[PDB]
Design a binder for this molecule. Structure first.
Ligand SMILES: *[C@@H]1O[C@H](CO)[C@@H](O)[C@H](O)[C@H]1NC(C)=O
Ligand SMILES: *[C@@H]1O[C@H](CO)[C@@H](O)[C@H](O)[C@H]1NC(C)=O
Ligand SMILES: *[C@@H]1O[C@H](CO)[C@@H](O)[C@H](O)[C@H]1NC(C)=O
Ligand SMILES: [Zn+2]
Ligand SMILES: [Zn+2]
Length: 410
């Protein structure tokens, strides 16, 4: 292709406005909930959500990476993990405002496509089906990036679609998958919350008939969580409905992008006959936070996709990261290239057939490919991270099998 398009994908910033270095490591960050921060530094701690400096450094690397981009995807989760009573609607909005404002200042001429996360509401997870203060606040804040039609829908349901200014036959569809997330009590027993399904189909139909391609953008991913058994993030009923819709329109959709897990994964959606037809990419978080009882977390991550500007086919992805430990040891923001996807795995591109082939390779007995994959899953938080057979089976099946029957069968 005569030119290469690029867009950034950042997700799960989870600013902790509370963060500051002090002698009492239980007081460094409210997001540790009273636990002693492990070894805190100017760029964060594994027991804390992101300090502002960490977030700023990610956007600063972007600015100075010497990579040109046509837009940016931003899949939500801006407030920190503190208990619900410590937060409020007002504080949540300020955090979102702050992130938005911070991006708009540093990238005054970049279109950015946001999606809401499950923490982008007070109380977390309970995102509603009708307009709400938050939905109207993000609409106001995101006007510079979106048209009136998208701003309307955003106010009513927290979802929208929008054509890309530099590639107006590419349409981004930004879903509120939070509506389908297990803990969301507001949508229980609703068949089509906020009408998203009907609006999604109708939008995908329009696209298909207007010679458009679509990138789907959302917070909670479809499918099975790669580190557990028979657990989908979304309630199964909505996972299955989205799957079938994505299969009906696998032609128009040229890629899907998700966050929420804070891990680096892929999924391959196959059509009803077992043929792979859509590639899905879960990007890891900027925040490094974990629970005290977890052995692993992710290092902070930022990524860059390459696409063919004629048909919007995905050509590659570049995953960048911050070695948290190193950065705090030196007090310097060293963002680095973790991998280039086609290089580390030797596949031609990011089309479904290529990713499917890669996943098949992971099922090799003692696959080195899968081992790599597993390290990158945690954005390289520990090299020595090994994996047992059961976990591998959970990972493999989740990559290749998104609906109930297939996954069990696997
Ligand atoms: C966002 O919040 C941080 C700490 O809460 C503050 O230092 C920073 O100045 C704020 N930025 C904007 C653009 O409001
Ligand atoms: C945190 O560390 C301090 C001093 O190192 C210790 O005395 C205190 O008990 C610890 N607190 C918790 C909650 O682990
Ligand atoms: C990051 O930093 C420390 C150097 O302080 C190192 O021991 C660890 O290997 C590094 N992580 C990676 C993925 O190389
Ligand atoms: Zn998150
Ligand atoms: Zn989330």
């Amino acid at each position: 292709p005569p030119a290469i398009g690029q867009f950034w994908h950042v997700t799960d910033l989870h600013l902790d406005p509370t963060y500051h270095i002090t002698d009492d490591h239980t007081k460094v960050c409210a997001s540790s909930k009273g636990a002693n921060a492990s070894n805190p530094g100017p760029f964060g701690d594994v027991l804390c959500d992101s300090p502002y400096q960490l977030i700023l450094s990610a956007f600063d690397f972007i600015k100075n990476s010497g990579q040109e981009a046509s837009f940016m995807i931003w899949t939500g989760d801006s407030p920190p993990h503190v208990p619900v009573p410590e937060l409020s609607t007002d504080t949540v909005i300020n955090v979102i405002t702050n992130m938005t404002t911070t991006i708009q200042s540093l990238f005054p001429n970049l279109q950015v496509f946001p999606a809401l996360g499950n923490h982008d509401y007070w109380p977390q997870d309970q995102l509603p089906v009708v307009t709400s203060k938050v939905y109207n606040a993000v609409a106001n804040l995101w006007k510079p990036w979106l048209d009136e039609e998208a701003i309307s829908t955003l106010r009513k349901g927290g979802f929208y679609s929008q054509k890309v200014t530099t590639n107006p036959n590419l349409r981004i569809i930004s879903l509120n998958t939070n509506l389908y997330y297990g803990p969301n009590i507001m949508t229980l027993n609703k068949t089509d919350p906020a009408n998203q399904f009907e609006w999604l189909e109708s939008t995908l139909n329009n696209s298909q008939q207007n010679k458009e391609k679509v990138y789907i953008i959302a917070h909670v991913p479809v499918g099975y969580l790669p580190s557990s058994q028979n657990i989908t993030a979304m309630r199964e009923y909505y996972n299955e409905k989205l799957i079938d819709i994505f299969q009906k329109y696998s032609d128009v959709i040229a890629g899907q992008f998700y966050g929420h897990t804070h891990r680096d994964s892929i999924m391959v959606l196959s059509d009803k006959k077992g043929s792979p037809v859509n590639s899905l990419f879960v990007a890891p978080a900027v925040t490094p936070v974990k629970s005290v009882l977890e052995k692993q977390t992710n290092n902070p991550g930022i990524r860059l996709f390459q696409y063919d500007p004629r048909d919007y086919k995905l050509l590659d992805m570049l995953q960048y990261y911050l070695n948290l430990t190193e950065a705090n040891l030196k007090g310097e923001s060293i963002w680095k290239l973790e991998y280039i996807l086609t290089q580390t795995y030797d596949i031609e591109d990011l089309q479904p057939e290529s990713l499917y082939g890669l996943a098949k390779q992971f099922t090799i007995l003692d696959s080195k490919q899968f081992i790599k994959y597993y390290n990158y899953f945690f954005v390289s938080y520990d090299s020595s991270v090994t994996c047992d057979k059961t976990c591998k089976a959970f990972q493999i099946c989740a990559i290749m099998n998104l609906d109930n029957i297939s996954y069990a069968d696997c």
